[PDB]
């Protein structure tokens, strides 16, 4: 059937690392039996179990780094957002809305009034 990921989030780093080793033994041992048998579909289950454990280990490791660079400048570049190269060249929301104080005075003095041609 295979390992379930929600179980593997609950284990620690040393529990998951040893589980990967035992899974790699089971893949190796089944790869031997596949040379005698004509069809061994259990390869697929152990192989996706390895991919599941290796995934959960990496999500534990990347979340440790996110707590390491938590709320400072200069995250690592793969922990930065991957919008679009143009979308991160991109004058930010603060910088695009910058207004010189000569323009800030005019915008406060004479904003667009709300009005209607009725009366």
């Amino acid at each position: 059937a295979g390992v379930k990921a929600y179980e593997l989030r609950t284990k620690s780093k040393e529990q998951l690392a040893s589980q990967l080793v035992d899974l790699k033994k089971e893949l190796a041992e089944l790869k031997v039996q596949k040379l005698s048998r004509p069809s061994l579909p259990k390869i697929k289950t152990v192989r996706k179990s390895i991919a599941c454990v290796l995934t959960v280990i990496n999500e534990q490791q990347r979340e440790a780094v996110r707590q390491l660079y938590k709320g400072k400048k200069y995250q690592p570049k793969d922990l930065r957002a991957k919008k679009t190269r143009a979308l991160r060249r991109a004058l930010t929301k603060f910088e695009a809305s910058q207004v010189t104080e000569k323009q800030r005075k005019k915008q406060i003095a004479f904003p667009q009034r709300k009005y209607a041609i009725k009366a």
Partner: protein, 135 residues
């Protein structure tokens, strides 16, 4: 003058198109200056240029360039227009002052070919515009 390369200086067109030596290069020497500086400094945007010297062989220009990634330009609202991507390499697209001069972009009856580009105008005035109910 621009020397037309055309190896051994040879035509192979009409004799109207037979000149090699006397071709004059529609963009100015100030434009070549900014284009060559903008290639060396592609992290910057060329803003303007100005003559500083000349001799028998060279004209000398000083080119003003602006860093669109420095935060003293990305803030300070008087200058962060240069940080928008429409202004990537203005000097190659001819959007500098010497580019707009040599493109002919000026108001008036003297610039009827070149007001919104001579090529755009030529496309407009050579288009057969047909309507649904033919006029």
């Amino acid at each position: 003058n621009r020397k037309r390369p055309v190896p051994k200086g040879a035509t192979y067109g009409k004799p109207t198109n037979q000149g090699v030596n006397e071709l004059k290069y529609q963009r100015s020497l100030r434009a070549t200056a900014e284009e060559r500086v903008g290639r060396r400094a592609a992290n910057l945007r060329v803003l303007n240029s100005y003559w500083v010297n000349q001799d028998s062989t060279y004209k000398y220009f000083e080119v003003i360039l602006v860093d669109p990634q420095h935060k003293a330009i990305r803030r300070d609202a008087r200058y962060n227009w240069i940080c928008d991507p429409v202004h990537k390499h203005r000097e190659a697209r001819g959007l500098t002052a010497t580019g707009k001069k040599s493109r002919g972009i000026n108001k008036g009856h003297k610039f009827n070919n070149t007001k919104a580009g001579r090529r755009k105008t030529w496309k407009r005035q050579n288009t057969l515009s047909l309507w649904r109910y033919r006029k």
